[model samples]
Target: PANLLTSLVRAHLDSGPSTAKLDYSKFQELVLPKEDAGDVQQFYDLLSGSLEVIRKWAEKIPGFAELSPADQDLLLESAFLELFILRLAYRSKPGEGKLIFCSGLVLHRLQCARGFGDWIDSILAFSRSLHSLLVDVPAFACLSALVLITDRHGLQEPRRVEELQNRIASCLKEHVAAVASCLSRLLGKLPELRTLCTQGLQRIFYLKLEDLVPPPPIIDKIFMDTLPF
Candidate 1:
C-alpha cells in the first residue's frame, strides 16, 4: 500500500545498449506484430488502471480529499503526467527492453515506440538513474507529495496547497538528513522528472498525429489542453 508502488515493483538498471545495433528504419515493419488486437487495449487499460490507483492514493492523502471537487480535479490533472511517469518507472523492468505495466502487461520497447516515440528510452533512462539513487518509499512518497502540492497556480486555494508543499519539503529534508548519503541529491530528481514529463508529453502529441492508438480519454483530456504540442 506504499505510494512507491512496491506491490509489483522490481528494480533493474537498463544501461542501454548502443542503438546502432537495432535498425531504426525497419521500426514497425520488422519489430511490432501486424495483428495487435489486445496490444493497444492493454496499454489503454494499464494507463487507465494506474490512474485510478493514483486517484485512490491521492484521495487517501491527508487534507487532499477535503478540498473542493474542482480543486481536487485540478490538482490531480496537473500532477498526473508526472505521477504516471513515477509509478510507471517504479514498475518498469526496462533492462528487458520492455515496460512491465502494473497489470502484468509487458510491452516491448519496439512495440511501445509506435506510441511513445523516443521518449520511451528517456523514461527508461530516468528510471534507471532513479534506481541508482537508493530510491525508496518514504522518499518517493514525499516526492509525490511535493509534485502534487507545488505549482498552485490557478488553484482554488494556492495558499493551502503551498502549505502542504512546505510540509512535504520539510519532511523530505529530514528524510534526506537520515539517509546521509548523496541523498540530498534525491530532490534533484524533480527537475529531471519535470523535463521527462515534457518530453514524454511531446511524444504523445506526435503519437496523436500518427493515430497509432487513440489515447485513453482520461489521460488525453488531462494532458491535451495543459500542454501545447
Candidate 2:
C-alpha cells in the first residue's frame, strides 16, 4: 500500500508540479464544460488544502528544511511522499509505551515524591525491561522522532498533548487483553514478552503495597469491663 501510494505520487510529480501549475481560473475553465464541474472543483479544493498542509509539515521538519527549493517543490508535487514521510516520522518510536509510561511516571514522581517513591523505582525498572524487550522492534524507531519534536518544542498545543495522552490510554486499554490472549495461545514462543510485562506490572503494584494491606479492627475490651462497674 505504501509503495503504491509512493508510485502514484511519483507519477503525479512526473506529470508536472501540481503546486506550481494549479491555477484556480484555468482549473475552472477546464472543468466548466465537463458534466462534473462541481465535483472537479471540490476535488481540486481538497487537493489544494492537502498541499498546503504538506508544505507546512515540510517546513516543520529539519531534514525537509535542509532540502533545496527544487527538492521541496518535488516533494510538494508528490503528495504521497509527504504523507508517507509524516507517517514514518509519527511511528518512528518503538514500543510507543515508553513515552506514555515515562511521561506519566515522571510527572507523578515530581508531584508526590514521598508517595510515589516505590512507583518511581518500579517505573524505572519497567522502562529498562521494556527497552531490552523492544530492542529489535521497528515500531519504536519512531520514538526518536517523537523525542526530537517534544524535546525541542515541548508538545505544541494542549489539544496535541491531549491527543497523545488519549492515544496512549487507548493503546493500554487494548494491549493488555490482546497480549494476554496471545500469550494464552502461544505460551512457549512468546513467553518472554508476556512475562516481562507481567513482571513490570507486579513491580508497579508492589510500590502500592500499603494501599492493598487491610486496616486492623479496634478492640472493645475496655467497654466490656466498664459496663459491669
Candidate 3:
C-alpha cells in the first residue's frame, strides 16, 4: 500500500503548532477576564489562524488541487469545523479543562466559556471520547485527512472526491486492525462534530449581531458559506 498520503499528513502534523508553554502569569493572559472587551477579536483571531492552518494542510493532500476551484472551496467550507474539532480534540488536554487552539494557544475551558459559550463543553466531551480511542499518530492523521476528503452536499466533483476519500480509507485501514469498528466509531463523531460546527456558526452570528467586533473578512466569508440557516 502506498503511504504517500499518510506521510504527507505526518509531516503536516509534525510541522504544525504544539502545546505552548505557559505559567501562572501566562494563565492570566490565557483566561478570559471577568469583563472582557477584546474577547471577540481573540476568538476570531484563533478561528482565522486555524483556518489558514487547515487550508495549507489541505493543499498538500494528494489530488486536492485536481478538483475545480469551486469544489475545493466547497470541501474546505463544508468540513472546516469538523477538521478543526478533530485537530483540537487531538491536541487538547480535556481532563484538565485545557483546550488548545491550532495556533498553539492553550486556554482554560472556563476562559473560553465567555467566547465559545456552551460549545466549549461539547468540544471537551468530544475530545474525551476521542482520547478514549487511544489513536496512534498514523490513525489520527488518516482520520483527519478523511474529514476533508469525504463527499459534501455541494461538491461539483463527487466522484473525484470519493476516489480521494477511498485512498485515505485504505491508509486508515493499514493502521487499524479492527477497521470496521474503528471506522464506525470515528465516523460516528461526525454528527457531533456537525452540531459543534453549528454551535460555532451561531456563536459567530451572535457576535456579529451584538456588534462587538466586526469579523475578519475571511471569517465573514466562512460564516456566509457555512451558515446553516
Candidate 4:
C-alpha cells in the first residue's frame, strides 16, 4: 500500500489557492470607506474565517477523528493561530506584501496599524518573509498539515500523535530535504513562521484577554476551552 502520510499530503497539496479577485493594494485605505462595523469586526472576521478553512483541512486527515478527543482539540488549539497566519500570508496580495482578508480588503502593514496595533509591524514582517520563501501550492498545503499534526505541550496520546507527526516529517524531508527539521530549509525561514504562530496568537488573545477588540469566538473560546465547533 502507498504511504498514507504522503497520500494525505498530496491530497491537500492538490487543492489550490484562492482565485477570488485578490486585489493587492498597498494603500487602499485612502480611497476606501472605513468598514461599517469598524476595524474590530473586521478583525474577528478575518481571523475566524481563516480558522474555518483550517478546520476543513484538518477533517480530511486520516485518523484525525480516531485520536482521543483531547488530542484533536490539543492539536487544533496549538495549530490554529499558526495556520491562521500561514493562510493569511498564503493568500496575501501576491508579491505586494499586504494581507487579503475574508472581505477581500487589502491594506499595507502601515494602513492596518490602528487595528493590528503593535501586531501590525510584526505581521508585516512575517508576511514579507513568508512571501519570499515562495511556497508552492502542493507543498504549502502539506506544510499546513505538518503544523497541525506536530508535537505540542501535552498530548493524551503523544505516542500516537508523534507517530503521525513523524510520518509527515519524514515526507517533508523526503521531498524538501534540502533543509533540516523537514520544511525549515525549504522556506529558509522556518524559525520566523513558528514565531508567528506564537507571537500572533499572543496579540490576538491579548486583545480578547484585555477586551481590546471583540475577539473571534473561535480563536478566543475554542482554543481556550479546546472544544469542537
The best candidate in terms of lDDT: 3
Clashing pairs in 4: none
| C-alpha lDDT score of every prediction, in listed order | 0.65, 0.31, 0.77, 0.64
RMSD, one per candidate, in order? 8.0, 27.4, 2.7, 4.7
Query: What's the lDDT of the predicted structure labeled candidate 2?
Result: 0.31
- The CA lDDT at 73 in model 4 is 81
For model 3, the superposed segments whose C-alpha errors exceed 4 Å read 18-25, 29-36
What overall lDDT, based on C-alpha atoms, would model 3 receive against the true structure?
Answer: 0.77
- Per-residue lDDT of model 2, residues 1-229, tens digit only: 2332233234323322333443323211111111123332332232233344445544543344444464444333423222322222222232332211111111222222233334334444444544444322222222222222221122224344344334433333344343434323322222333333334234324432433322111111211211223
What 10-residue stretch in candidate 4 is worst by lDDT? 29-38
How would you encode candidate 4's per-residue C-alpha lDDT over 1-229 as one tens digit per residue?
0355456655564333445654555346354332223666656766776666666667777767777898888888777777676667666654554666644567765466555666656666666666676766556755767778877667889888888777665666665543354366554555567776666666565566657456655667654653222
lDDT score, residue 200, model 2? 29
C-alpha-based local distance difference test score of model 4: 0.64
Per-model TM values vs. the true structure: 0.75, 0.24, 0.88, 0.75
**What ordering of candidates by TM-score runs from best to worst?**
3, 1, 4, 2
